[PDB]
Amino acid sequence: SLDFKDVLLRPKRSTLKSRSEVDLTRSFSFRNSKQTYSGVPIIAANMDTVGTFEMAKVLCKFSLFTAVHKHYSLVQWQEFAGQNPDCLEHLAASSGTGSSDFEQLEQILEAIPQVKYICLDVANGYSEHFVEFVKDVRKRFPQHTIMAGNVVTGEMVEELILSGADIIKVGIGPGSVCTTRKKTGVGYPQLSAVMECADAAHGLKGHIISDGGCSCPGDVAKAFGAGADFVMLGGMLAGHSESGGELIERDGKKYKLFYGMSSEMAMKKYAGGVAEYRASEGKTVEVPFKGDVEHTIRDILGGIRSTCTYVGAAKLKELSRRTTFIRV
Amino acid sequence: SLDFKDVLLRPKRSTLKSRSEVDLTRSFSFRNSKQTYSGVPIIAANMDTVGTFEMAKVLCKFSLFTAVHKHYSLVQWQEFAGQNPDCLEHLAASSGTGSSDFEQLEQILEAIPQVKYICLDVANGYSEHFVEFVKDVRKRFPQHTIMAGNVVTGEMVEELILSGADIIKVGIGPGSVCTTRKKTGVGYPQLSAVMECADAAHGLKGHIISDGGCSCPGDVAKAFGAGADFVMLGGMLAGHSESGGELIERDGKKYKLFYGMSSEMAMKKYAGGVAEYRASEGKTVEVPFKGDVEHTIRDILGGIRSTCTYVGAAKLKELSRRTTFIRV
Amino acid sequence: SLDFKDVLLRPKRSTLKSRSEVDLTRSFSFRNSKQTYSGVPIIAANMDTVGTFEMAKVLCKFSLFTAVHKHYSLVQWQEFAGQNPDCLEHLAASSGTGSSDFEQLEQILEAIPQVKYICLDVANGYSEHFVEFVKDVRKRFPQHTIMAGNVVTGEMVEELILSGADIIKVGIGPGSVCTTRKKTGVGYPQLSAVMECADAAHGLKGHIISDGGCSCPGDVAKAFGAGADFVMLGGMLAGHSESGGELIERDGKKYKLFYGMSSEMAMKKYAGGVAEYRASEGKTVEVPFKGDVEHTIRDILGGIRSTCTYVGAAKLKELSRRTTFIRV
Amino acid sequence: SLDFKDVLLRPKRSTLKSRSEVDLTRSFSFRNSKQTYSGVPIIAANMDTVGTFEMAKVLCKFSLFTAVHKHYSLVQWQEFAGQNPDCLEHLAASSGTGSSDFEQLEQILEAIPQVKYICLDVANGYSEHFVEFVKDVRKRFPQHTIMAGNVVTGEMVEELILSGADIIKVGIGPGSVCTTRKKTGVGYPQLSAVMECADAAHGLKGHIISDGGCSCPGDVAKAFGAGADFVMLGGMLAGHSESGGELIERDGKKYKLFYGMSSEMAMKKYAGGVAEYRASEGKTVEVPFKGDVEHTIRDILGGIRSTCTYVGAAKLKELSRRTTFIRVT
Ligand SMILES: NC(=O)C1=CN([C@@H]2O[C@H](COP(=O)(O)OP(=O)(O)OC[C@H]3O[C@@H](n4cnc5c(N)ncnc54)[C@H](OP(=O)(O)O)[C@@H]3O)[C@@H](O)[C@H]2O)C=CC1
Ligand SMILES: NC(=O)C1=CN([C@@H]2O[C@H](COP(=O)(O)OP(=O)(O)OC[C@H]3O[C@@H](n4cnc5c(N)ncnc54)[C@H](OP(=O)(O)O)[C@@H]3O)[C@@H](O)[C@H]2O)C=CC1
Ligand SMILES: NC(=O)C1=CN([C@@H]2O[C@H](COP(=O)(O)OP(=O)(O)OC[C@H]3O[C@@H](n4cnc5c(N)ncnc54)[C@H](OP(=O)(O)O)[C@@H]3O)[C@@H](O)[C@H]2O)C=CC1
Ligand SMILES: NC(=O)C1=CN([C@@H]2O[C@H](COP(=O)(O)OP(=O)(O)OC[C@H]3O[C@@H](n4cnc5c(N)ncnc54)[C@H](OP(=O)(O)O)[C@@H]3O)[C@@H](O)[C@H]2O)C=CC1
Numbered sequence A, B, C: 001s002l003d004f005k006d007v008l009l010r011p012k013r014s015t016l017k018s019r020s021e022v023d024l025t026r027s028f029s030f031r032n033s034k035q036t037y038s039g040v041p042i043i044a045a046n047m048d049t050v051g052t053f054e055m056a057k058v059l060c061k062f063s064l065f066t067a068v069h070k071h072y073s074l075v076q077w078q079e080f081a082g083q084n085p086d087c088l089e090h091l092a093a094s095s096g097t098g099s100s101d102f103e104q105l106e107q108i109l110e111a112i113p114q115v116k117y118i119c120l121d122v123a124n125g126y127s128e129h130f131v132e133f134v135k136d137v138r139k140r141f142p143q144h145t146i147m148a149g150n151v152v153t154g155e156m157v158e159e160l161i162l163s164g165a166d167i168i169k170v171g172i173g174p175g176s177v178c179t180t181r182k183k184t185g186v187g188y189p190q191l192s193a194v195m196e197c198a199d200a201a202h203g204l205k206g207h208i209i210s211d212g213g214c215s216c217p218g219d220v221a222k223a224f225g226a227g228a229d230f231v232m233l234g235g236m237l238a239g240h241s242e243s244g245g246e247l248i249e250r251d252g253k254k255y256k257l258f259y260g261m262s263s264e265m266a267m268k269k270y271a272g273g274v275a276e277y278r279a280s281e282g283k284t285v286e287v288p289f290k291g292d293v294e295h296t297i298r299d300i301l302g303g304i305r306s307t308c309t310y311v312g313a314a315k316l317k318e319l320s321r322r323t324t325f326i327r328v
Numbered sequence D: 001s002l003d004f005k006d007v008l009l010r011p012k013r014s015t016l017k018s019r020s021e022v023d024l025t026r027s028f029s030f031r032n033s034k035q036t037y038s039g040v041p042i043i044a045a046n047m048d049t050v051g052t053f054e055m056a057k058v059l060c061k062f063s064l065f066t067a068v069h070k071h072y073s074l075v076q077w078q079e080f081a082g083q084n085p086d087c088l089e090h091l092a093a094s095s096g097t098g099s100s101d102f103e104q105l106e107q108i109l110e111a112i113p114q115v116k117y118i119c120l121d122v123a124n125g126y127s128e129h130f131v132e133f134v135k136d137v138r139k140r141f142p143q144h145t146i147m148a149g150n151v152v153t154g155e156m157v158e159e160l161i162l163s164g165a166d167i168i169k170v171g172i173g174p175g176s177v178c179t180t181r182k183k184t185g186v187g188y189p190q191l192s193a194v195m196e197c198a199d200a201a202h203g204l205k206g207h208i209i210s211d212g213g214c215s216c217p218g219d220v221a222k223a224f225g226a227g228a229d230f231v232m233l234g235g236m237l238a239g240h241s242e243s244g245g246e247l248i249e250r251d252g253k254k255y256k257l258f259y260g261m262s263s264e265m266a267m268k269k270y271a272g273g274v275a276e277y278r279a280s281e282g283k284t285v286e287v288p289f290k291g292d293v294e295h296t297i298r299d300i301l302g303g304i305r306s307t308c309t310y311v312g313a314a315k316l317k318e319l320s321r322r323t324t325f326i327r328v329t
């Protein structure tokens, strides 16, 4: 029942001389889409303040991935893709399960063929309705790679992969601005979830994303060491120039809003308020302004290269197999 | 030795599509009164700041229950009942073991025949005196549903049910303004208390209330998942317009008093003071003003519907069967 | 490896009706002095700010015990004894191992025959030198009851009782103003120390004092439940009118100094400062002023009566038999 | 998986009557250099703010050891050595693995023959490159005692001794101004590291230094109790008159900078800044000014003498043997 904070990685004898030797890119072949990936498998979350086109343009320079948020117009996507043809390779267009979500997704994918990834995202990936929607999307777009979540346990990972998803998004409640655990009491320790779900997915030649709960580069490295193919970040990418969220300067200091997608703040913006039978399951915070995201990416990547050197991993694909966790 | 903070509920595969589909009402048939209940089994605690007639009026609209405090006059009761006849089915009148308390209860029940629940409430329900009192109240009021507590272990749950109580109130020391544990060292972790006492009660076709220790909706869901038939709330319901407690406006902010029923504040108010051989076993806090309780009810119920969807429960009665706790 | 915080007492079926029914006095017959005791076995520590004459005078009225500090003159003792002839029964005169300490102790005992207890107190009761001192004091005063400490393990409890001590003082490092653990790393969790040492002592028909680490009446109740015959209190008794320590009014609030007997404050007062080879093993704090100690005594005794009613103990003597600890 | 905070020492019967009776010196014979040591085996860390010449001069008086930082020039070393001929016996010159570092060290050792210890110090002692370096250094200076680290596990302790190191420096991430754990997730709880590495070292009649994570005298005592031959201190020695770090008087209070050697502050000073592929693995703090280090040394040593009296150790040599740890919540 482990969280990131409960472990450390044991160092091991290595032949690496310098952190600059470490290759942080991965190559994957996806189970169902049959497409191939090559890049640095860290993903900007599809939160409205994080999965922005400005984030994408910077993350592209480092070969990182963006799951674009679901609140841009087709026109905005077309403007982005026209101005940034070389950044469409590691983007996913996102959708929930509504008719309207699906139709807007379609419009994007039809108009911008270079977008080859789909991020299907719900709070509760255990619903049969969600499973059925994944099948539906696989059938409509057989050659796109599908990321689907969220879940925390292997039976659901398997069902979702067998239903047509390529990459399962793992995590219920670990997120920095999530309040699901406080409102519902439901969840799973994130490191344990990653280990269980990685094993399940990899038994089927599928993949996973560790989604949420990382607050330092060491956490990112732990999720990878536990078998995550990709790691998705919200909070660590919030608060930058390139992030969304209002910039607030008060009492001589600068902040940016950062908020859960099921916070009252988000529901006020996009659902016309909070439905009577719902409770909010995210919160709002004000993040001290961090400046340009490039400096944060370099810190994260720098940390992970260090991790690899300490365990003797010359390439990110070696990190999990050379990871021995010490309980602390 | 589990508390609510030590666990999460595991999600499970679900045919539920929306949280709006979840029915939170239960029906119970009581062992000794032979009466039947229908409602949302969340009870406002019989504290003078929580179990108020203003609270009852609002909770009634949501089919929630109020254990009315023991400090209203007979005419206040008569006035309430006259003005709010449809509220009377979801209320209990309360008493401790004092001859004065019981006599005032008898006058209320004589005046208000519509009150069909009795809440017999002492700090130490392990006393043979309390056991005997319960037997006497059963003999006196054969058709009234009797809630009796408090205890934390099965042997006492069984004895209390066999002596004539329908519903056993579980918890010693977990309350937000309780200081019993600090003053006496006595108590029992609440989640374990609920698990153990639920098994003991259910084996005899009786019922329990998890009383105390919930500070968010997820805790309430954990209590129900652990087998509690009802959950009683003090602090979560304190600090509202409908709550008791002085409203205090100071340093630009508003607060409401909230205090334990064995605090010095309560004893000064209703015993004249603290008797020489006694210690206070409650504290006072100032709760930032919360506004109208309807918003808090909606949040709590919304959290629990979300729990139910995550574990596949279409009805609250299915929650405990569908609950697998993960240790955190 | 239990500290007080690690456990709660399980409640049990009781025939107690009222906390007023509980007798907190104990009767002891001491192994080596052959003297008898009757009183409430809580002791004000022999710290210079706690074991004062003003403290004794109040504690006396409750039948509590005072280990008088070792920094009164003989004239001071005679004055107290002359003015308070009925408060001499539950007093001890204190000494360390030095010849000047012994000479002063001897003057007190000779001049004040009503003083029938001796408190032999060193930081490190494991020294053969302390053992031999205990033996010598036993030989010199065969009808005086000897408290001796401090130690935390059974073997040493036994040695000290067999060397002539009646009551063994248990605790190394738990005290509120102690820094031994930070400075040395030496200690033993106090609840486990009490359980182990009480068994060792009782097997020889001797007694122990749980010395240090209580910060609420619940802790005192836990110590007694774990088998301690007496409980000694420093911090809980510091900061009262009757306490020593300078009264400091600053920034409109009142405080009283409270410091370790191994602190730099103490060694400056009574040694020539700190010897080059020693480190201080106590600290200084300013305790917000508590007023009269009577109120604190009532809070402590009331808490312990409540513990006894909860576990079915009519007498403090029964509390440890009736104690079942639950680990939290 | 223990840290210092997870344990206490159990007192035991003794015949000691005063803390002043306790002998805190140790004598060691080193496996590979064959040289001998007599002193109090607490070492000032080779951080630029701790392993200074001012520090060394004071620690000398108490028979404590200094691993000098690697950022003094030859001329500064010669000045020190000419004014303090007797303080040279418990000094180590430090180096990392680069050719420039090796050359600086080689000049110091050639110019000042009285310096008989070498501290080879990298963040990652698990590197084959580091092992080959230790071997090269043992080849070049066969009679110098070599401290080499850092590592946290016994296999690497063994390999480094077999490769020619005498004393292995143990600790990855426990340090007060280290952020390696937050940046990489890598580490090992320090008390357990010490117990494992001390067994591995001692099997081969080598020695270890517990490096990092001590924040009170008790932690020092615990490290010795777990079998560390030496204990190295950064934070506990920062903030003094003798420490490096700028003295900053602000808001009516005095502070001294103390920072990790992998911090942005250090890399700005000694490298070009931070290379694009590196992350900072240390932080900067401002430590309230502590005054003269002598007073801190006396507090540390008095603490450890007290531990020894409580467990019956008349000499520091006895402490580990007489140590029984109790696990604490
Ligand atoms: N990671 C997260 O927590 C995220 C949460 N949201 C939140 O999810 C909810 C639905 O989002 P929307 O975009 O309208 O539709 P989606 O496309 O996200 O599809 C989710 C569907 O699942 C249903 N549902 C069933 N169980 C749950 C549950 N336990 N928690 C949340 N939804 C559940 C919702 O219905 P119903 O609401 O009737 O129960 C909704 O129809 C909103 O409250 C939204 O703010 C949105 C994005 C990410
Ligand atoms: N559930 C919990 O953890 C707690 C609940 N309470 C709440 O606060 C109210 C405060 O009432 P309070 O004045 O404490 O007493 P109660 O209302 O519980 O007292 C009823 C009778 O129990 C007796 N009694 C016996 N043992 C105890 C004991 N250990 N603690 C308290 N009473 C005891 C009292 O006698 P006597 O006073 O002479 O001893 C009295 O005659 C309770 O009625 C309850 O609603 C209070 C504390 C803890
Ligand atoms: N509970 C506590 O921590 C108490 C602390 N004190 C402290 O104990 C020390 C001696 O007090 P004093 O009144 O002179 O003599 P004491 O009669 O209290 O006896 C203590 C004797 O034990 C010796 N000793 C051996 N080991 C230790 C140790 N680990 N810690 C403390 N003393 C030890 C002392 O010699 P030496 O000092 O040379 O080592 C001293 O001669 C002082 O520093 C004093 O402040 C006094 C009473 C109780
Ligand atoms: N003991 C500990 O917990 C730590 C100690 N440090 C202290 O700070 C200094 C840091 O300077 P720095 O250059 O960062 O490290 P080092 O002094 O340890 O560098 C020596 C060589 O090791 C290489 N190296 C390989 N892996 C790593 C790694 N994981 N982390 C750091 N270097 C690695 C470096 O190359 P390249 O830089 O190209 O990768 C460099 O060429 C150390 O010398 C040490 O004093 C720093 C962090 C942790």
Ligand SMILES: *c1nc2c(ncn2[C@@H]2O[C@H](COP(=O)(O)O)[C@@H](O)[C@H]2O)c(=O)[nH]1
Residues within 6 Å of the ligand: A045, A046, A047, A150, A171, A173, A174, A175, A176, A177, A178, A179, A180, A211, A212, A213, A214, A232, A233, A234, A235, A236, A259, A260, A261, A262, A263, A281, A282, A283
């Ligand atoms: C719960 N979880 C939520 C909410 N909005 C987003 N998220 C989740 O958090 C992840 C990011 O976690 P960080 O710790 O910030 O990196 C997102 O990717 C998503 O899974 C919400 O309102 N409630």
Ligand SMILES: O=c1[nH]cnc2c1ncn2[C@@H]1O[C@H](COP(=O)(O)O)[C@@H](O)[C@H]1O
Residues within 6 Å of the ligand: B045, B046, B047, B150, B171, B173, B174, B175, B176, B177, B178, B179, B180, B211, B212, B213, B214, B232, B233, B234, B235, B236, B259, B260, B261, B262, B263, B281, B282, B283
């Ligand atoms: O003074 C007190 N001491 C201990 N428990 C109390 C006191 N007053 C009320 N309670 C308990 O605390 C419960 C509510 O706890 P909460 O919901 O955590 O605030 C009540 O229903 C009582 O059982």
Ligand SMILES: O=c1[nH]cnc2c1ncn2[C@@H]1O[C@H](COP(=O)(O)O)[C@@H](O)[C@H]1O
Residues within 6 Å of the ligand: C045, C046, C047, C150, C171, C173, C174, C175, C176, C177, C178, C179, C180, C211, C212, C213, C214, C232, C233, C234, C235, C236, C259, C260, C261, C262, C263, C281, C282, C283
């Ligand atoms: O300076 C000291 N160092 C360590 N223990 C001390 C010191 N001075 C007093 N004590 C102990 O602390 C006890 C009181 O502990 P307290 O009740 O937690 O404050 C005393 O009875 C002594 O045993």
Ligand SMILES: O=c1[nH]cnc2c1ncn2[C@@H]1O[C@H](COP(=O)(O)O)[C@@H](O)[C@H]1O
Residues within 6 Å of the ligand: D045, D046, D047, D150, D171, D173, D174, D175, D176, D177, D178, D179, D180, D211, D212, D213, D214, D232, D233, D234, D235, D236, D259, D260, D261, D262, D263, D281, D282, D283
């Ligand atoms: O920047 C850093 N990152 C990691 N460890 C460091 C850094 N700087 C110094 N250290 C280590 O920290 C030790 C001192 O730890 P301290 O005694 O807890 O402050 C040094 O001897 C080094 O091993």
